[PDB]
Amino acid sequence: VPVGMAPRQMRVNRCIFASIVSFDACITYKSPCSPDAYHDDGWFICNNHLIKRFKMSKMVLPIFDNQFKMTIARHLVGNKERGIKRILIPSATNYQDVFNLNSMMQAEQLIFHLIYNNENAVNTICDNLKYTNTQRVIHSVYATTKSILDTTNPNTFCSRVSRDELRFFDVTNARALRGGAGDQLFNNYSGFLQNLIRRAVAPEYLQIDTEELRFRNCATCIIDETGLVASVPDGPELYNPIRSSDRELDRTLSGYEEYPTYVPLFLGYQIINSE
Amino acid sequence: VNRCIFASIVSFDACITYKSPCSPDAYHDDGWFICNNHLIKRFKMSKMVLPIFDEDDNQFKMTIARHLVGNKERGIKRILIPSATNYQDVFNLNSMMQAEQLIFHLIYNNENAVNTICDNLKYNTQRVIHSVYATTKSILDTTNPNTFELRFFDVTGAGDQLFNNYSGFLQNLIRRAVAPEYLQIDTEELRFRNCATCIIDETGLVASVPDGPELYNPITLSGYEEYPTYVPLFLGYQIINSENNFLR
Amino acid sequence: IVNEKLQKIIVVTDGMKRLYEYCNCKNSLETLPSAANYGSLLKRLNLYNLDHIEMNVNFYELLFPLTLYNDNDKTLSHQLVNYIFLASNYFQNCAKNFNYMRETFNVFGPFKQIDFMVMFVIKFNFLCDMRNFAKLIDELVPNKQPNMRIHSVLVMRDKIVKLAFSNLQFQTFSKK
Amino acid sequence: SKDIVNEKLQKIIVVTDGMKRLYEYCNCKNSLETLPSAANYGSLLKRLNLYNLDHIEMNVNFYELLFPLTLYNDNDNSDKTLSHQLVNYIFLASNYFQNCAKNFNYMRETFNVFGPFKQIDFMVMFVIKFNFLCDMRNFAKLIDELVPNKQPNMRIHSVLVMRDKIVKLAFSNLQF
Ligand SMILES: [Zn+2]
Ligand SMILES: [Zn+2]
C-alpha cells in the first residue's frame, strides 16, 4: 500500500519571516507567506511580510528597446499618516519603538533583533530559549536568519550582492544644505536592510556610462536617522488611497490604460558603467 | 455615431489623399473632442484616465493624457500644443490636407488663411469645404464655454492667461490632458504629484519639467505586476466648488 | 604637484574677487544664477573686457582637489558626492537655459559682452559655493596618496557636464 | 557675439605672437602630423621648468579654440577647397588631441627622460598646446584675413561638434 522512492528536491522559501515558527512543539503554527517567496529574486522577504511590517508592496518597473526590467516597491502610507507612521523602514535606533516586539512572536522578535544587530537582545533570547526542543528551534530560526543575513551582507565577498554599482540614494534634495548622510546610515544599515532598500527604492535617475535617464523629477521618499521615511521631500504629502490588505462617469470612461494610483519609491541616482 | 476633430475632412478635392484615419475611440463619447489617432499624430499624446480612491467611494477615472515625447526632443519637437503664434510653424501645413489646414486656422483664429484656402479651393469643392466648416465650427462651439473649477495651471496668472488665450476646443484639450498636481475636493486639498510633468508657456504646451534633464520617455520578475514607465501630463491647482460627490 | 591646486584655487579666486571688486559669496545658489543677485557684478565686469572666458568648466579637474582632504574619521565621503551631483545638475540647468540666463542678464543693462557676463557669473557663483564648501571642510587636511572610487562618479558627471557645455556651444555658434 | 569671436581670433594671433617671445619658444616648424616628441622641446622644456605649470586645464576647449577660424569669406565662391582644407585641419586637430590624450602617459615617460621634474604632468600638456598653437599660427598665415562679422555653416559646425565630443571624452578619461 505505502509508496515511496527517495528524498526529493523542492522549492525554497526566500523570505526571512518564513522561518517564523511557534516555539511550541505541542502547538502548531504556520506563518502567512506569499508564494512570491519562492522566486529566485533579490527579494528576501515575501510580499505579505513586507506589507505587514514595512508598509510596502513589491512592484516592477520595466525600463526600456533595451528593456532591463528592474524591481521596485511602493508606498502604503496614508496621506494623513504622520510622525512614526511615516517611517517606512525603521533604523536600528528606532526599530524597537516602531515594532511592538512585546506583542509579537518571540521568534519574530529575535529575527528583527538579528536584522538590526542588537546582539545583546539576541543573546538574551537565546539564553532564555536554551534554559527551558527549544534549542532545536533556536538552531532553526537563528541559522536561517543568519544565513540570509550573510547572503545579503553587501560589504563582503562570496555573497553575490555587490555589482560594483555606485548608486547614491543620499543624493542631495538640491535645496537642503550640505548634508545627506542617508548613505552614511546606509553604510551602518544591516546587509539585508541595505539590500531591501536597494530593491524597493528605485533610483530617480539611471546613469549608464555617459547616459542619464530621468524617471522621477522629485523623490517620493527620504532616508534619515529614523530610516526610510515615506515623506514628500517638499512638504505637502501625496495622497495615498489605501484600498485593501492591512460611477456613471467611470462607466462612460471605458478602459484607457488607466494610470495607477500608487506612489512608487523614487530616490537617488544609480551609477553603472563599463569600467 | 462618433466624434473626432479632423475626421470631418471630406474629399473636397481630387489632389493628395484621404482615408479617414480615426481611432475607434471616437465612438467613445468621452469628454474629449478628439480620438486617439488624431491626438497622437497631432500632439504626441495618448488618452488615459485615472481612478482616485474608495474612501468615499468616488474612484472617478480622472482624465489624463500620456507624454509621447522622449528626453531628446527640443524646441518644436518638445512642444505638445502650439500657440496660435507657432502652430503653423510646428505643423507641416504643406503635408496635411487643406481641410485640416482650415481646421487649424479656425481653431487658432486664422480666418484670413481660412478664406484664402476657401477661395483657392473654389477653383462641389466649395460645398464640401462648407460642410467641413459646419462640422468644425459645431465642435468648436460645443467646446466653447460661451453658450447657454479654478483649475489653475500656474498656482500649484500668466499660465492661466495663456490657457484662456487658447480656444474653447484647445482649452478643453488642455484641461482634459493636463492633470493638476493638486486637487481640492470641496475643502480637502489632496496632492497627487510632488512635481510637474509639463509646462505651459508662450509657445504653448511643452513636455518639459521645471528643472533638470527631461524625463526619459521611450516608445525575470514574472511573478509581480508592472508600473507604467511613461510620463503622464501634470500641471496646476484645481479647486472643486461647493458640490457633493458629483458622480454625474 | 598634486596638492598645490587647491590652495592656488583659493588664492586665484581671492585675487579675481579683488580684481573685479566683488566677493558676493553670501548668495549661495542651487537653482539658477540671476541678475537679481549679480546685477552689480555685471556692472563691475563691464569695466574690464571679459576676453578670458571659457565655454567649459573642466568639471573633473576643477573639483578634483576637494578629494585631497583627509576623511579618515563619514562626512566628506558623502558631502563631497552630494556636491558633485549638485554641481552636475547646476551646470546642466545653466547650459540648458543659458539663452534664458543671458536674456535676463542683458535685460539688466544690456552688455556687448553679455555671453561673457553670463558665463562669468556662472563661474563666479560656482566658485563661491565651492569656497563655502571648502570652508565647511577646512578642518580636514588635504594631501596626496588618494584612493577614492568616487572620482569615477566625478569622471562620469564631468563627461555629462562637458556634453552639456558642448550642446550649449553648438547652439551659440550655429545661431550666427 | 561673432564680432567678439573675431576679436578672439585676432587676440589669439597677437597673444601667440606675444608669448612666443615673452618665453622665446616659437617651435614653429612643428605641426599636428603626429604625436609630438620631447626631442624637439628639450631646451623649451628647460625654460618651462623655470615656471610653475599647474596653471593649466586638463581638457582642451577644442570648440572655442577652433570656432573663430570658421569665420571667413566663404561667400567669395572661388575656393571651396579652402573650406575643405578647414575641415581637414579641424579633423586632424581632433585626431592629434585624441592621440595625445590616449598616449599621454607615453609622453609622460618621454618627458621623464627629458627633464624628470614633478611638473611633467603639466609640461606634456603645455608642449601639446604650444605645438598646436604654433600650427594655428601657421594656418592663420596660410589663410587670409577674410573674417566676416557673422557667417553660418552647418556642415563645419557639425564636424566641430562630433569631433570635439570625442576630444573632450578622451581628455576627461585622463584620470588620476
Ligand atoms: Zn513569506
Ligand atoms: Zn479619429
Swiss-Prot record, chain A:
Keyword Cytoplasm applies: no
Gene Ontology CC terms, in alphabetical order: host cell nuclear matrix; viral capsid; virion component
One Pfam family from the record: Baculo_VP39
GO molecular function: structural molecule activity
Localization, UniProt: Virion
Keywords tagged on the record: Capsid protein, Late protein, Virion
InterPro entries associated with the record: Baculo_VP39
Family: Belongs to the baculoviridae major capsid protein family.
Function description: Most abundant structural protein of the nucleocapsid produced during the infection cycle. The monomers are arranged in stacked rings around the nucleoprotein core.
More info: Expressed late in infection.
Protein's name according to its UniProt entry: Major capsid protein
Gene: P39
From Swiss-Prot, chain C:
Superkingdom, taxonomy of origin: Viruses
Subcellular localization, as worded in the UniProt entry: Host nucleus; Virion
Function noted in UniProt: Structural protein that plays a role in the packaging of nucleocapsids and in their egress from the nucleus toward the cell periphery.
Subunit description: Homodimer. Interacts with host nuclear F-actin.
Protein name, as recorded: Capsid-associated protein VP80
Protein species of origin: Autographa californica nuclear polyhedrosis virus
Encoding gene per record: VP80
Residue span relative to the full protein: 490 to 668 of 691
